[PDB]
Ligand binder design. Sequence first.
Ligand code: FMN
Ligand code: SF4
Ligand code: SF4
Ligand code: SF4
Ligand code: SF4
Ligand code: FES
Lengths: 52, 35, 214, 429, 118, 106, 91, 262
Amino acid sequence: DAKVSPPKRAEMKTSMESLIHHFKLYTEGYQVPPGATYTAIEAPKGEFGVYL
Amino acid sequence: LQHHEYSTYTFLDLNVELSKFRMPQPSSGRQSPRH
Amino acid sequence: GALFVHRDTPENNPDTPFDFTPENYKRIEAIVKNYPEGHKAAAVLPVLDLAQRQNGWLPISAMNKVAEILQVPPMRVYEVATFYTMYNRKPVGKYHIQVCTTTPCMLRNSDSILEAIQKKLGIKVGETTPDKLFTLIEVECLGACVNAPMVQINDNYYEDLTPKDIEEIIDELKAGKIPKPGPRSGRFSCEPAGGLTSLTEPPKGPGFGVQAGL
Amino acid sequence: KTSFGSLKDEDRIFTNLYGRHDWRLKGAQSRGDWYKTKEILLKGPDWILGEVKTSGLRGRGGAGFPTGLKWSFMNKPSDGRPKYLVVNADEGEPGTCKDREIIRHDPHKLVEGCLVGGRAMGARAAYIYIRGEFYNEASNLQVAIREAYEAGLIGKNACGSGYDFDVFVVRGAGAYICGEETALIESIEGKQGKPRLKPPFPADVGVFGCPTTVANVETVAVSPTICRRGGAWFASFGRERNSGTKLFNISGHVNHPCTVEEEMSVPLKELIEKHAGGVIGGWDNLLAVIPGGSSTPLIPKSVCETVLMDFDALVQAQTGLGTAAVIVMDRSTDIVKAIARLIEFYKHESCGQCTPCREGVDWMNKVMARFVKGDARPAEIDSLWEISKQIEGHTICALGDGAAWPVQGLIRHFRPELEERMQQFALQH
Amino acid sequence: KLDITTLTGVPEEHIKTRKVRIFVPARNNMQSGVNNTKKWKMEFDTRERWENPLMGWSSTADPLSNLVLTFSTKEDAVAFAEKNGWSFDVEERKVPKPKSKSYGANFSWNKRTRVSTK
Amino acid sequence: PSGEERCIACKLCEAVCPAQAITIEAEPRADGSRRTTRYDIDMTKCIYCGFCQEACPVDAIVEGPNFEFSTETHEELLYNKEKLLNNGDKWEAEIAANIQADYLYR
Amino acid sequence: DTRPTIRPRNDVVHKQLSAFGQYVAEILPKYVQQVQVSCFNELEIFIHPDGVIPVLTFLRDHTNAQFKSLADLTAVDVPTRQNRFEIVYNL
Amino acid sequence: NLIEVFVDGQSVMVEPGTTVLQACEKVGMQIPRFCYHERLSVAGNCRMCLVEIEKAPKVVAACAMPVMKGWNILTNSEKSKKAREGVMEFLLANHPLDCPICDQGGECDLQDQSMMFGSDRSRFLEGKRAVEDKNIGPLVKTIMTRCIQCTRCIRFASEIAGVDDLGTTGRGNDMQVGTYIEKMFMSELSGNIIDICPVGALTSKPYAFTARPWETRKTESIDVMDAVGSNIVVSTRTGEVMRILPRMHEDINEEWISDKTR
Ligand SMILES: Cc1cc2nc3c(=O)[nH]c(=O)nc-3n(C[C@H](O)[C@H](O)[C@H](O)COP(=O)(O)O)c2cc1C
Ligand code: SF4
Ligand code: SF4
Ligand code: SF4
Ligand code: SF4
Ligand code: FES
């Protein structure tokens, strides 16, 4: 999904759509839909959570 | 087979001859709407 | 193949001598009288056609003169001259050979006619003869797509062509002659090649089939 | 009636298609033209519109819109602006040469049709927009109009009916897009031949900003005969909702290419094999036929075997009637090359105004050239289909549809040939 | 009235000398998008930005030079400015007028709206 | 390879830098090309993330292989455009070789 | 939608969380103001600030709600509200 | 007089003659657009504003199509999404890969609308076109390879500036915007063709290459060059005025500023 993850440099230097998205993702970035979440994982030191 | 009597100005000459038959044109109210 | 930007040249500059003859001015007057008052800008195409028909091609000075006469911005005349194909913005030869290469023509082996023209004149498509007598250019269906390969030289249609026929036409043109326009196979019109399948009976006449009273 | 496709010469509207008689006023009057024209105009616009509606006449330009209601769209009280009738004589569709014959050999019929149509729509005058390449035809039309003016048929007090009407001929300049009604109006107004966006429709805002109706040469020329001989007589020919006598142009790989005024809903095989001597090499050598010029998708021999040449029958056959220009291609034809040439024609004859048209037509031209060379991949056929679908329906004019439809027809009916040619190109390298 | 100024910890120089502006940001003229012109914003007054001697970087001694608070309505922004004792300056929101646009006017018969090119 | 700088002053390497270590100023050069007049990166603020080399569309800014460049003073770590250009010319052979070895994964 | 790019959605957990939110709202209507279930299966209960101790003690001790672990306790500053500080409890 | 139309089902009362785009703007939906400008005549050629009307088989152009009572406008329907993606793909088919070097970068309508409504990759395997640059003056830097033929500059000149010098020459894929002759677009309002142009085809020569939009700080101020008191935005970066942009004030300067002010 080139609107979240940057395209390959080979695609970026050959594709107009890829260059636009590469330009935007590294200047503004991807917009995240409004909302909140608490995602936690089993980190080596215990539960590591992020309330984004 | 009468098409080989037509010169370059044949079409326009016939248009000139019809200017008398044509009736007066209408008017938008100005010389050109750019005015 | 052509350029749609104008670069000033000694033979094509805003100061290049051009002006309509008084008879051409009368024709322009009639053309303007055709269209309603307040919309004399509608005459850009016919006036440009007249300018090209008089001069042979369309220098920038011709476009400026047309704009001045019709009191329209010169850029509008430039747009009109660049949009359409029949307006020659560069000087052309005496005879403008235009060959239809669209599918209907292509099926009837129009490429043979094009090859014959190239072999005879010795110029490729788009080139002008060294003596400035003929110009070769391929075009689209000229509205006679049922009449075998067809070339338009100036205002005349030459249809139902064969390579030998096109060679003969070119020879006649180069030898100061007026080749007969129309089909060159034997037929007079879009009728079937051998034998009329319709309209064999004489016309009925006036008043035939008049319904009731009208 | 059950079986159609055999018209009698007594019923043919155009009795001088081949130019075997006089094309001047004397010949036209001897052939029935201009008879009781004063009474037709004195009947009233409503009567003329009713006759056109009863005739079941549909547009011969290619759209096939009901002519009667289209013309009655202009039948409104005057709003202080003049009304005009515009005749579409551009004839730029490849394979279409029917209007050329009408103008060249039957010009007075067109003038009488212009007068009748203008009376029906209350039009002040008639601007005939003839193709720029048609110069001799324009000269013939001008001579016919001059004769009509001299006889008093048109002009002030036309045919003594008390109706004032003028006929103008405006030559083209070499643009196929000017065949489009709104593009033709723009060309008449003196601008670039770029089609307008609807609404406003020409019936409300048209040429010079006045109510207008654009109509094909055949659609206008058949009107006096419809009014005289009757709407029922005109409707008597052809299937229901596909009624009338149609001009057909039979080009391509046929023994005797010609143009004949057959009856609507005529079988395609009967039309080809009777008036043109069949396909070159027999009907068993027919690869595909484009029924309606270039904008209509092709149909293979299987479809051509049993199909009627009318609007509805061809619509069901995944194609269209269009201008009834029957392009015939034998089995020695490189069908991909022919379709690529048509797409190149649309590329060279694109107004370049709408983004889908301007970009996608050239894109499809490049893709079709690579297909002709075989320099592509099998996965690109579906991509080209999607490109054609994006072009179709998303443009201003119907030239986008007219350029997408040939590609869609080719992909639908000959995809194995494309894939086989791609395989050939891949193997060779 | 809320006088949280003594609790925010802001030094006196940045409470009284400041001049907060409350406004809806104007649309970036380079773009036709209007999504940014929907929420009220609060910014302080621009102050000195001298040149760093070593590198030429633009130095500053204004801690509030980058504060841009976004509010849903004007009243909330005014209340928040009053809470912290900041001299606010409200600018009324400007909304583009409803404009009568007609494509048919491009081909007018007796009006100047008739365009010469498309 | 021609010898000219790849940096065309698109400034997205500065925009992506999470530490805001890159400072870029550009003007139309005498030839009219997009060339930076100032390209300053403070190695004392950089987090050595690589986001700069990953954002550059012309492979101009590139974190090279050198890691032993410790200085006795703080000021030496505030790199100029001249410092970076000089660095690039010194490590080019190795930087190129590394790009050639790794660019297929990028 | 489907296919690898999209994130799969689990309706079962959504239904269970909605049911449990209704359960909590019914048991504690004095403090619960709003109940939401996000599309990624996270349950939120909105409580009047006086209901901190009652609702949390219920969610810790109730046999049908044994949230015995306080995952997180944070605040969100939204200066556009009368009550700018929004205290969030993660159990 | 107010007729009733629906935008995504929601009712809204609009005046007769209102366009689909304005009806959608009333409820808060900003339909993507390139050719349409509020202060210019409706063109309808970019085709980006295509939207699906419920129960209708064809997608209308919201920038030009006037609403009819009872219409339900499906702004986010699948037909609208596919139309927008196809139009964006066609626009980006021949567009040059100049984003890093284009001064419109970061504030480009084509980029943002590709990010929001267009696809994320290209199927265009062919070679892009190239257009010779046209010199139209010492202020507007012209890189015509980026032009998307939206005809905003032509309409702006011909209507707001009265200078009928800009226009389209040729047809098809070869159509080129700009004066046919080597002429200078001399006007006191010529600077606004830089702002109206969505792509970086027309760019400010003095502002060329100097800064990127995301880093500039915007200060809203008032012009003092003349007595009109035009509202302007002073775009500063690191304590230095980088450019001056117009600020919308319907009662003073609408959306334009003079060349001196700019
Ligand atoms: C690309 C294009 C080319 C067209 N060419 C012609 C033409 O050559 N002759 C014609 O009568 N109609 C042509 N049309 C159709 C016209 O737009 C218009 O619908 C027609 O002239 C009126 O047909 P009718 O009044 O007989 O129904 C063309 C349409 C398009 C989109
Ligand atoms: S180093 Fe690369 S990314 Fe940074 S400004 Fe130069 S070209 Fe752009
Ligand atoms: S590695 Fe590059 S992007 Fe990362 S902090 Fe350092 S300069 Fe910035
Ligand atoms: S105009 Fe926009 S999309 Fe085109 S190159 Fe410039 S920044 Fe990129
Ligand atoms: S130069 Fe810019 S404003 Fe003018 S037509 Fe091209 S894209 Fe539109
Ligand atoms: S915004 Fe409507 S077609 Fe361009």
